[PDB]
Amino acid sequence: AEQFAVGEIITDMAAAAWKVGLPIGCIYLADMNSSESVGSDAPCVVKVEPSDNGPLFTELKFYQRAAKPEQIQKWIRTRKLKYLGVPKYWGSGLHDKNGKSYRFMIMDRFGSDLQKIYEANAKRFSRKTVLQLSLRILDILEYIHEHEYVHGDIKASNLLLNYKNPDQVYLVDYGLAYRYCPEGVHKAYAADPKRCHDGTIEFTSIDAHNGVAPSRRGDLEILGYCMIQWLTGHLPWEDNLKDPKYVRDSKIRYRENIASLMDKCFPAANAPGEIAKYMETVKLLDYTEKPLYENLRDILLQGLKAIGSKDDGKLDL
Ligand SMILES: O=C1CN(c2ccccc2)c2nc(Nc3cc(F)c(O)c(F)c3)ncc2N1
Numbered sequence: 001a002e003q004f005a006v007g008e009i010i011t012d013m014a015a016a017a018w019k020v021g022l023p024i025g026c027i028y029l030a031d032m033n034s035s036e037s038v039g040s041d042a043p044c045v046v047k048v049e050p051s052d053n054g055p056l057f058t059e060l061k062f063y064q065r066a067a068k069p070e071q072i073q074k075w076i077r078t079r080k081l082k083y084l085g086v087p088k089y090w091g092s093g094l095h096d097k098n099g100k101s102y103r104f105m106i107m108d109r110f111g112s113d114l115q116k117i118y119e120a121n122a123k124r125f126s127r128k129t130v131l132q133l134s135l136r137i138l139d140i141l142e143y144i145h146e147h148e149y150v151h152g153d154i155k156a157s158n159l160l161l162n163y164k165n166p167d168q169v170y171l172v173d174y175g176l177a178y179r180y181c182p183e184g185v186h187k188a189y190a191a192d193p194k195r196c197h198d199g200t201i202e203f204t205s206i207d208a209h210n211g212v213a214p215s216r217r218g219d220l221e222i223l224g225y226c227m228i229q230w231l232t233g234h235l236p237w238e239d240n241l242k243d244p245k246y247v248r249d250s251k252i253r254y255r256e257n258i259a260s261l262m263d264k265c266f267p268a269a270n271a272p273g274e275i276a277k278y279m280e281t282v283k284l285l286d287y288t289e290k291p292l293y294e295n296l297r298d299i300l301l302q303g304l305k306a307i308g309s310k311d312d313g314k315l316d317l
């Protein structure tokens with residue numbers, strides 16, 4: 001069922017006007033209202049789902065609470081970042097069509113996801129690429145965590161490049177994000193009945209596998225698994241993904257003995273030491289503990305020095 005008439009002008013709750021274009025989720029290209037058609041270079045998209053769709057409501061609340069353009073810009077200035085890979089929220093509203101009620105949200109438009117590029121590079125990223133990606137993901141995670149949310153699902157298909165700058169990566173999809181610390185009150189170590197999602201099996205946290213709500217350590221552990229996947233093309237448990245008990249078992253045992261994970265994943269005597277140090281630091285976090293993000297970034301920065309590079313912001317894709 002078509003939600004829009006292509007080229008129609010829609011007006012958000014702030015009375016800002018937008019024009020709808022072709023699909024690019026039900027997601028269409030969008031631009032500011034003008035006499036021009038919405039082109040394939042549109043700077044925004046519009047996401048539209050039925051008003052009872054739970055994930056779009058969750059996502060919209062995240063973007064309204066944490067991704068207001070000026071809120072992001074203030075953080076960038078105060079923390080002296082080059083950029084922050086949290087997509088900007090440009091507006092939202094309600095759209096009725098043919099007796100059905102929809103919700104819409106206007107967001108930044110992006111270029112390619114990282115999964116497409118990874119697969120086009122025969123399922124490897126370089127050590128430089130992985131460290132540069134991970135430093136920027138650590139900035140993103142620190143930001144969302146400080147604004148009471150965890151992503152719980154970091155992976156290359158949720159990492160998009162800036163449409164006009166292939167050195168800037170953004171983390172998307174907050175439909176199943178989780179508000180772990182509402183009003184500064186950390187959730188307890190237990191399932192949340194209101195949350196059904198377990199993440200993506202090959203990358204998800206041990207916490208998620210144990211049926212508890214995701215927290216900050218879980219996001220950092222997910223990134224850990226991504227790093228190994230990216231560096232090596234593989235994870236140890238990838239042939240057993242239909243059995244969650246198996247996946248959890250392997251992650252638990254590998255966490256208890258990170259040296260064995262390094263031996264499994266990398267050629268003998270040739271493991272990148274910053275990855276092990278990263279995993280060891282994450283292993284020391286309690287369920288409610290605030291990560292020392294700057295120490296984690298320092299660990300990755302020590303890896304760039306080790307390979308004769310520096311954090312120059314180049315993703316080398
Ligand atoms: O080919 C595509 C499909 N696609 C996509 C990729 C991965 C996942 C979802 C959509 C795109 N999404 C976006 N924007 C976007 C998506 C979000 F999900 C979000 O939260 C947000 F703020 C912004 N721009 C261009 C895209 N090109």
Ligand SMILES: [Cl-]
Nearest residue numbers: 071072075147
């Ligand atoms: Cl803020």
Ligand SMILES: [Cl-]
Nearest residue numbers: 123232233234
């Ligand atoms: Cl391979």
